[PDB]
């Protein structure tokens, strides 16, 4: 009952035994009366309130240890509590930015369908307020037209933390597509256009485009290739199956229906 309420909360997380012990607190949190339906006894929803906040700092441990599946695990039960089946009272002040780290979680990872099924539950709470969502939502509006590096002209604005874990996934998510666009039919913007305008102040990124992709930069530029077939059109391949189609035509037309 209230095991290690604030043992290592404000200071740091020097010991990971408080992790599994707090999860031992979630052993009873989920099993006092209920966790999903939460039929009655609103007072049991209070340690589901703190059960939410402890999952929030738990996802702050997952964000510290690069823990994606556990991170979404925390946000689930969290969001599970915000869609608690009973109309309870105010949860906390920590929901709106928590869903900010959820929305930055799911935005940078190419989750657009998942994205636009998230901003429709609190109709006016993530448009004109809740900067922890307003930065992700205007972020996605940047991800709308062409404002993907314009985001990086807008990186210096974060409300709480670095947001590094999804300014970096927002790096890569533009990296597969700049790599694909350069792999498209194109005539080789030089090393200075593919290496200085974009990111990567001459690291082994030249190993990234030179190894992950083509465009072999030896003589002062990247270098394309055909990226096309030889137009192998038989057109007599359907000469069998189409005859089958006609045979079906006179088949059903000739059958006594």
């Amino acid at each position: 009952m209230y095991e290690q309420l604030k043992g290592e909360w404000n200071r740091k997380s020097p010991n990971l035994s408080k992790c599994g012990e707090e999860l031992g607190r979630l052993k009873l949190v989920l099993l006092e009366l209920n966790f999903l339906p939460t039929t009655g006894t609103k007072l049991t929803k209070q340690q589901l309130i703190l059960a939410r906040d402890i999952l929030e700092i738990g996802a702050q441990w997952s964000i510290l240890r690069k823990d994606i599946p556990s991170f979404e695990r925390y946000m689930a039960q969290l969001k599970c509590y915000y869609f608690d089946y009973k109309e309870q009272l105010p949860e906390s002040a920590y929901m709106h930015q928590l869903l900010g780290l959820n929305l930055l979680f799911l935005l940078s990872q190419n989750r657009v369908a998942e994205f636009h099924t998230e901003l429709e539950r609190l109709p006016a709470k993530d448009i004109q307020t809740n900067v922890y969502i307003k930065h992700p939502v205007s972020l996605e509006q940047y991800l709308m037209e062409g404002s993907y590096n314009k985001v990086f002209l807008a990186k210096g604005n974060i409300p709480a933390e670095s947001y590094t874990f999804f300014i970096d996934i927002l790096l890569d998510t533009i990296r597969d597509e700049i790599a694909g666009c350069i792999e498209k039919a194109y005539e080789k913007i030089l090393f200075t256009e593919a290496t200085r305008i974009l990111f990567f102040n001459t690291p082994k990124k030249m190993t990234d485009y030179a190894k992950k992709r083509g465009w072999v930069l030896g003589p002062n530029n990247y270098y394309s290739f055909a990226s096309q077939q030889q137009k192998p059109e038989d057109t007599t391949i359907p000469s069998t199956e189409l005859a089958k189609q006609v045979i079906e035509y006179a088949r059903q037309l000739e059958m006594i229906v």
């Binding site: 999860l23 052993k27 339906p37 556990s70 695990r73 689930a76």
Partner: protein, 153 residues
Amino acid sequence: GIISLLDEDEPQLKEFALHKLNAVVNDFWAEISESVDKIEVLYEDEGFRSRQFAALVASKVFYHLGAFEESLNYALGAGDLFNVNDNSEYVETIIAKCIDHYTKQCVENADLPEGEKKPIDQRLEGIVNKMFQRCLDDHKYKQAIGIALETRR
């Protein structure tokens, strides 16, 4: 989300996992359709101390999935938890399929009673003769003789 409720591999969350399975065992088999490996791999656990229960909830979902046979198979792989559960109006579906598969299987075995006979499952027939006990109890015996003919026994 809400779904990543089951992202822990703890042992007592294996017995609390079943406690969540029978809790969510009713409706969202549409979600369990994407949650098949979450039920199949959960069924695949030597250190799981409530074995065949993931086949209980599995036979719950695969009906909704559209696998009329899969819920029957894992209903076989549900152990005593399925054999004890035979008084319901939903289970009459899976048991109707069970007597269909059963009577056709028995006509098959009666076809060739020697050599390469498709073996009938013990838990397959365990609710079969149990249903015949229903034939013994529900005050009607044209049924009990009826399945007696088709069963090739």
